């Protein structure tokens, strides 16, 4: 349809605020939608939504549309909002006096809260009408709107205050910046772990029994960098989950799956070396081939039971307004769980493996000083990394995970996500820590030439 250059700016504004979907999706009420929040129908029939879409677009879309087609739909919604604004004696005086950029901020509010909701801002609207930008920005910052949706409102208020697109220019610079850093993190995890996996499979010297456990670690860390970290990066750079409610449950399960398998494998490796370093002869006899494959299967079976079973059975769901809101919203994929699962998952994933690894590696330090310049220094710094890097990466998260479940207000969501990325970073550190043998080095060099 007819596009303008103003029209494209208000399109990119909400593309950032609300997201763009070029395929039919469901909104918070289960209603079929496309584009930037364009309701197709309240009918539960996907074909009926496809008929409404084809009538409006003027093409057999079969549910998929282009960006230009989404802008056609978007501009119609903007025209309707504007016609509403002009019929309302509370919004027309303010609207008529605003420049085009601040005029898009007001339309943004109406898309978020509705015509009636925005008309209740009597005093802020009067201040905007009188071009009292800083005073209007202060008053709006005190709003219920600001406290409910601070990031959205910071961007909109900056638009009222300055009349520029700076808040959205800055958001997009940040988005590309983190996307770079995320892709780098994804590269290190995948490369380092795929390098360890192939080194074991193409070298008979490396196919020992201890390194069979390290293959489990490298595999639990490989799925992390292929499925968990990449999709977890989409929530950071785009502020939303973009893949529907069903994939949020699966992604969350694969997340808890791999984190459980990876840390418990560090626990098995910690036990393995303890037996070989202390009682190497009973070690070589009791730990058979099938027993080593017995532990790894047990680790993964436990990991599936604590991830796919409770999450898909909705046992992990909290029952507050904040939690139920995120569950009904496909665009929300926050890790919000009840107290029982938050503790039970933390114990099975982190706290039990921490206690074993801490106790085991402390006793290796004990029996080393009993049977004594000395090389005890080079082995102590080694233990300091195996436990230091592990603890430093996951301890902040699993402290916040248990606390936040009881006191939701103490752990900010920003800080909570950050602690979870420290743990994500362990999947890159593990191949550096556990594959430092001369056998790996001769193999790594033989793989890269």
């Amino acid at each position, epitope marked *: 349809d007819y596009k303008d250059d103003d029209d494209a700016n208000i399109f990119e504004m909400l593309r950032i605020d609300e997201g763009l979907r070029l395929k039919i999706y469901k909104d918070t009420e289960g209603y079929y939608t496309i584009g930037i929040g364009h309701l197709l129908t309240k009918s539960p029939s996907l074909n009926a939504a496809k008929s409404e879409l084809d009538k409006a677009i003027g093409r057999n879309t079969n549910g998929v549309i282009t960006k230009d087609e989404a802008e056609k739909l978007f501009n119609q919604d903007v025209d309707a909002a504007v016609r509403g604004i002009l019929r309302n004696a509370k919004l027309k005086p303010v609207y008529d006096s605003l420049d085009a950029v601040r005029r898009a901020a007001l339309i943004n509010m109406v898309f978020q809260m509705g015509e009636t909701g925005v008309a209740g801002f009597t005093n802020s609207l009067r201040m905007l009408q009188q071009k009292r930008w800083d005073e209007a920005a202060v008053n709006l910052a005190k709003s219920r709107w600001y406290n409910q949706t601070p990031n959205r409102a910071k961007r909109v208020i900056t638009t009222f205050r300055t009349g520029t697109w700076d808040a959205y220019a800055a958001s997009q610079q940040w988005t590309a910046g983190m996307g770079l850093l995320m892709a780098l993190i994804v590269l290190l995890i995948v490369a380092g772990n795929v390098l360890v996996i192939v080194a074991i499979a193409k070298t008979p010297r490396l196919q020992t029994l*201890t390194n069979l456990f390290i293959m489990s670690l490298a595999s639990a860390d490989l799925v992390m960098g292929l499925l968990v970290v990449p999709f977890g990066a989409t929530i950071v750079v785009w502020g939303r989950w973009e893949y529907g409610s069903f994939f949020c449950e699966l992604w969350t399960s694969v997340d808890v799956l791999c984190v459980t398998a990876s840390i418990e494998t560090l626990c098995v490796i910690a036990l393995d070396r303890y037996l070989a*370093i*202390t009682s190497p002869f009973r070690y070589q006899s009791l730990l058979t081939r099938a027993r080593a494959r017995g532990l790894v299967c047990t680790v993964w079976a436990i990991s599936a039971l604590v991830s796919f079973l409770p999450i898909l059975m909705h046992w992990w769901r909290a029952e507050s307004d904040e939690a139920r809101r995120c569950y009904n919203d496909p665009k929300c994929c926050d890790f919000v769980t009840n107290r029982a699962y938050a503790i039970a998952s933390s114990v099975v994933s982190f706290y039990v493996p921490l206690c074993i690894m801490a106790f085991v590696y402390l006793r290796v330090f004990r*029996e*080393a*000083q009993k049977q004594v310049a000395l090389r005890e220094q080079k082995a102590l710094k080694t233990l300091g990394i195996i436990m230091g890097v592990f603890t430093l990466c996951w301890l902040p998260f699993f402290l916040a995970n248990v606390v936040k479940a009881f006191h939701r207000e103490l752990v900010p969501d920003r800080l909570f996500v950050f602690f979870n990325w420290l743990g994500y970073a362990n999947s890159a550190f593990n191949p550096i820590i556990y594959c430092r*043998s001369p056998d790996f080095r001769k193999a790594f060099q033989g793989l890269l030439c």
Partner: nanobody
Amino acid sequence: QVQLQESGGGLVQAGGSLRLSCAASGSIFALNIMGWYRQAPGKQRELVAAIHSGGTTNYANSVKGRFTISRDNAANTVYLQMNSLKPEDTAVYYCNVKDFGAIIYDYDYWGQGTQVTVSS
């Protein structure tokens, strides 16, 4: 850096005895395995006696009873007091040391070897 010296090798008649001595210089981690390996012409390398820093032993069952391995208190040396020699024990005996300074893997220290031929 770390070198291990290898003494006690020689030729002896069937039924005699020997006493291999291996002294390892350099610094090593407190938990280790000092062992002896033999390779006869033809057949590949095999272990005879290993001794852990705690005291636990492991003797090849074709070799146990006749052979005894020991460690020195406050000295990085291993002694293989061997008796009742048989002509099937003609092999170069190697001194091996398992270092556990890096906790995740084993770090082998090998030796040059001492020839041992048993006559009749």
